[PDB]
Design a protein around this ligand. Structure first.
Ligand code: HEM
Length: 153
């Protein structure tokens, strides 16, 4: 369970993301797909993209980035009270997309990498620790829902 002070470090860096969610989403998805190319195979719409240049030019990838960060933003703003937000996400990601918890770990690593690069003003050691705690809480609660839904993850 996070402290309020931990949540405030999460939400202070998220406010900087929100200056340009589309730009942050492009950097995070590109870092994910470069670090773990197997994750790109889950995306029928743009799994054909071969290069970072193609990824940066993809309007569909930019929309995916906005969607992921907006949904995660809504979850973080609940400060752990995210049961309602996680239900539909768990069901789609378990049953339709088939996203293992390992891949949620990979995108968490991508988010931390991009925030550390972009936001040294709001992403010092304490803030990164708070964000890791919030993302570990998210993955713990998703993993519990995957199990309820019948997915090994
Ligand atoms: C912070 C983690 C994540 C959040 C908040 C998130 C949220 C979403 C949302 C809101 C959607 C659209 C509605 C839906 O289908 O449920 C979506 C779609 C999807 N997500 Fe995620 N997601 C996350 C992580 C992942 C990861 C790591 C992958 C794959 C490696 C993944 C694969 C997909 C796919 C394949 C779609 C459908 C995209 C399409 O049809 O073009 N998601 N996700």
């Amino acid at each position: 369970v996070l402290s309020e002070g931990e949540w405030q470090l999460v939400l202070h860096v998220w406010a900087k993301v929100e200056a340009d969610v589309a730009g942050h989403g492009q950097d995070i998805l590109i870092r994910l797909f470069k670090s773990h190319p197997e994750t790109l195979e889950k995306f029928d719409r743009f799994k054909h993209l071969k290069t970072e240049a193609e990824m940066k030019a993809s309007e569909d990838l930019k929309k995916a980035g906005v969607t992921v960060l907006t949904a995660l933003g809504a979850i973080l703003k609940k400060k752990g009270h995210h049961e309602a937000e996680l239900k539909p996400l768990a069901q789609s990601h378990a049953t339709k997309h088939k996203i293992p918890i390992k891949y949620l770990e990979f995108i968490s690593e991508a988010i931390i990498h991009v925030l550390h690069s972009r936001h040294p003003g709001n992403f010092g050691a304490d803030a990164q620790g708070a964000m890791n705690k919030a993302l570990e809480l998210f993955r713990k609660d998703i993993a519990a829902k995957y199990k309820e839904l019948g997915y090994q993850g």
